[PDB]
Write an enzyme that holds these catalytic residues in place. Sequence first.
Site, PDB file in Angstrom:
ATOM      1  N   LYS A 149      16.857  10.346 -25.097  1.00 33.35           N
ATOM      2  CA  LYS A 149      17.976  11.075 -25.695  1.00 33.35           C
ATOM      3  C   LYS A 149      17.874  11.164 -27.207  1.00 33.35           C
ATOM      4  O   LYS A 149      18.865  11.434 -27.884  1.00 33.35           O
ATOM      5  CB  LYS A 149      19.303  10.416 -25.321  1.00 33.35           C
ATOM      6  CG  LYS A 149      19.573  10.347 -23.825  1.00 33.35           C
ATOM      7  CD  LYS A 149      19.776  11.724 -23.242  1.00 33.35           C
ATOM      8  CE  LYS A 149      19.992  11.659 -21.746  1.00 33.35           C
ATOM      9  NZ  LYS A 149      21.221  10.915 -21.394  1.00 33.35           N
TER      10      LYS A 149
HETATM   11  C1  MGM Z   1      28.906  14.892 -37.580  1.00 36.22           C
HETATM   12  C2  MGM Z   1      29.397  16.204 -37.049  1.00 36.22           C
HETATM   13  C3  MGM Z   1      30.905  16.320 -37.024  1.00 36.22           C
HETATM   14  C4  MGM Z   1      28.554  17.155 -36.606  1.00 36.22           C
HETATM   15  C5  MGM Z   1      28.968  18.487 -36.028  1.00 36.22           C
HETATM   16  C6  MGM Z   1      27.791  19.301 -35.566  1.00 36.22           C
HETATM   17  C7  MGM Z   1      27.230  18.733 -34.283  1.00 36.22           C
HETATM   18  C8  MGM Z   1      25.931  17.976 -34.494  1.00 36.22           C
HETATM   19  C9  MGM Z   1      27.848  18.869 -33.063  1.00 36.22           C
HETATM   20  C10 MGM Z   1      27.311  18.271 -31.777  1.00 36.22           C
HETATM   21  C11 MGM Z   1      28.159  18.558 -30.537  1.00 36.22           C
HETATM   22  C12 MGM Z   1      27.629  17.903 -29.269  1.00 36.22           C
HETATM   23  C13 MGM Z   1      28.657  16.985 -28.637  1.00 36.22           C
HETATM   24  C14 MGM Z   1      26.362  18.107 -28.756  1.00 36.22           C
HETATM   25  C15 MGM Z   1      25.795  17.450 -27.488  1.00 36.22           C
HETATM   26  C16 MGM Z   1      25.099  16.094 -27.775  1.00 36.22           C
HETATM   27  N1  MGM Z   1      24.277  15.522 -26.686  1.00 36.22           N
HETATM   28  C17 MGM Z   1      24.694  14.161 -26.332  1.00 36.22           C
HETATM   29  C18 MGM Z   1      23.143  16.276 -26.059  1.00 36.22           C
HETATM   30  C19 MGM Z   1      22.158  15.878 -24.934  1.00 36.22           C
HETATM   31  O1  MGM Z   1      22.389  14.586 -24.357  1.00 36.22           O
HETATM   32  P1  MGM Z   1      23.258  14.453 -22.997  1.00 36.22           P
HETATM   33  O2  MGM Z   1      23.338  12.929 -22.660  1.00 36.22           O
HETATM   34  O3  MGM Z   1      22.699  15.260 -21.845  1.00 36.22           O
HETATM   35  O4  MGM Z   1      24.730  14.888 -23.421  1.00 36.22           O
HETATM   36  P2  MGM Z   1      26.079  14.960 -22.645  1.00 36.22           P
HETATM   37  O5  MGM Z   1      25.958  14.510 -21.222  1.00 36.22           O
HETATM   38  O6  MGM Z   1      27.018  14.058 -23.493  1.00 36.22           O
HETATM   39  O7  MGM Z   1      26.522  16.429 -22.777  1.00 36.22           O
END
Ligand code: MGM
Lengths: 346, 314, 5
Positions: free
Chosen positions: B110
């Site tokens: 991840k």
């Molecule tokens: C610091 C800040 C406020 C940044 C804003 C800009 C960003 C980076 C937003 C990210 C939004 C987000 C929640 C993206 C998904 C992150 N993951 C955890 C992606 C892949 O991993 P998985 O474990 O499959 O994720 P999940 O099952 O939680 O969707």
Amino acid sequence: LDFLRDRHVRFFQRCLQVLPERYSSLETSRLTIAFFALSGLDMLDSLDVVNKDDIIEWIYSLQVLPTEDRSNLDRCGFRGSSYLGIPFNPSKNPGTAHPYDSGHIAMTYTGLSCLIILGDDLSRVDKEACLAGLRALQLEDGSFCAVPEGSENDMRFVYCASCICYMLNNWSGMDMKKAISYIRRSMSYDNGLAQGAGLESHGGSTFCGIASLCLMGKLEEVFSEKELNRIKRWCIMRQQNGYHGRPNKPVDTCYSFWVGATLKLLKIFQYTNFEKNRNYILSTQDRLVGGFAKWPDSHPDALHAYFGICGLSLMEESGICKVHPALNVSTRTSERLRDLHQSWKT
Amino acid sequence: FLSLDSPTYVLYRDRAEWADIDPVPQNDGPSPVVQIIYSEKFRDVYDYFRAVLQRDERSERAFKLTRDAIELNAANYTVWHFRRVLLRSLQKDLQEEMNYIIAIIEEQPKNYQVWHHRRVLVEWLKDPSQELEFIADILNQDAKNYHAWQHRQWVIQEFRLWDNELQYVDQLLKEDVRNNSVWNQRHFVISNTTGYSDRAVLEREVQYTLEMIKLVPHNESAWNYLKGILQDRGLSRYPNLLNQLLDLQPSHSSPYLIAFLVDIYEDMLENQCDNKEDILNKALELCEILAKEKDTIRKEYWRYIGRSLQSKHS
Amino acid sequence: RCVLL
Ligand SMILES: CC(C)=CCC/C(C)=C/CC/C(C)=C/CCN(C)CCOP(=O)(O)OP(=O)(O)O
Ligand SMILES: [Zn+2]
């Protein structure tokens, strides 16, 4: 149960202080941990418990300023921390050349965001340099990278660029037409927004996409009413009690903000079930150490503590400021920004 | 070579080969914020990393130093960048690096930085020969890993490897028909090959989905795919679909089915059908069924939808 | 945990 407010204020306090070597992997993203903590205190109206001046200096020491010859404009913005070993300089003297020193779009975002939350007026921010660096990050397809040296590109950084351009109140930082194109192309067959074209629509990217458009003030202009209705349907379907980020995925506290904020921007968060959501967010509250976790009976952290609070904020929790759903700062702070903007316009 | 946990491990400040280099310390000034406390070993490796970086030293000893910095913190994107710089300068064997990163990613599936590094390597080698299999393994310890699916779609698209994906999809949907990531993968493949304009394909797919729906009627993913591939051509333009669903209602009912129906009726009203006022009632009747009994958690939403329909077709 | 960067 109830919201242990003070407990949470102490929690964010500790975060700004010292962390266990077990958080070493956050080294290059320390500034976003600061944000979670500061903006979190702001949300709880407790910014007094910190020395705004010391922190403002620390933040400014993280700015990548242009060198004498200004040959590093494409690399200006903010660093996540001082891990490169550059001599502490609170944006007082010119930039000291370094083969690998340059900003990170998420850091420039949370950096500026932090400065505003602390009351600073951004006078020491080389706005033109930042915007120059931002432009350098956008790709042909409209999305952005995090650093000029190269990185993955997706909706996360499109939202960062949007927030930066909005805060510096200048959109010369990006090619908005191309960015909007990217955001559109990311809509899935199920009507949610994904990290990029073809990928699985996701609550996180949907927030980034919608929020970016709102920040550019082009929501209505980019998506048709029919389209917006389909997106709303996708979002509202994320609530199980708390919110999950994708169909058939377990709920996670932080999505009460990611999705909740999107529903708010789409003006239908009001039709969601508040009690079940609130109950879930609280079930993940650590009554002992403070903060929140993604799931109940799980360890808390700055991210879920902050987003868990912002989630509660959306439903006007007793004792929490209203959060500006698109900018991810308290409304109070969003307003201080409006004034700050007017000031410049003279 | 010398592992970080080896009995004979030695701090860089005590290594002959590093005598000439002056370690560069990190400094967060007077009042440090969100400061992480580091062990002697940790601080040591990085104080030398900073040194080498600052001097952009493209040495072989630097290349090795990165392995240690990465073990201490694989999330440091600068370290990975510099390592890539060195991979080129020192013209290192990229096939070897592929093994390295394959191990790393397995340990940290991840981590954004590691998947990026692997993507860059595959681009360099222009060799996707081991990608699909690798991803399939990672997808075994987490069939919904977003990083994995993203990388998979990149490889497939970049080297046009569609040939066997639709089969892989069929296999995973059997292991877990509720995996939304696989349903997305299915649409990804089809729309990037045959497309859905071939009525033969559209038919095959609508049929395939209805079969999966019958196996597990309460599956948002399956329903979203079905509505997805038909919503744009016009849900009301498929008279036999409306009936086949109305028939399922008795035994395979679920909020997803009722919702689909509402959407069909709305498409009709949208296309000035026969019995405008009669249809609207069939819609509203369902909206209320959703709000009052089928999808209560969205009670306020469905009522809102109802009021929306009523004030748009009366 | 939720890695965002
Ligand atoms: C610091 C800040 C406020 C940044 C804003 C800009 C960003 C980076 C937003 C990210 C939004 C987000 C929640 C993206 C998904 C992150 N993951 C955890 C992606 C892949 O991993 P998985 O474990 O499959 O994720 P999940 O099952 O939680 O969707
Ligand atoms: Zn989370």
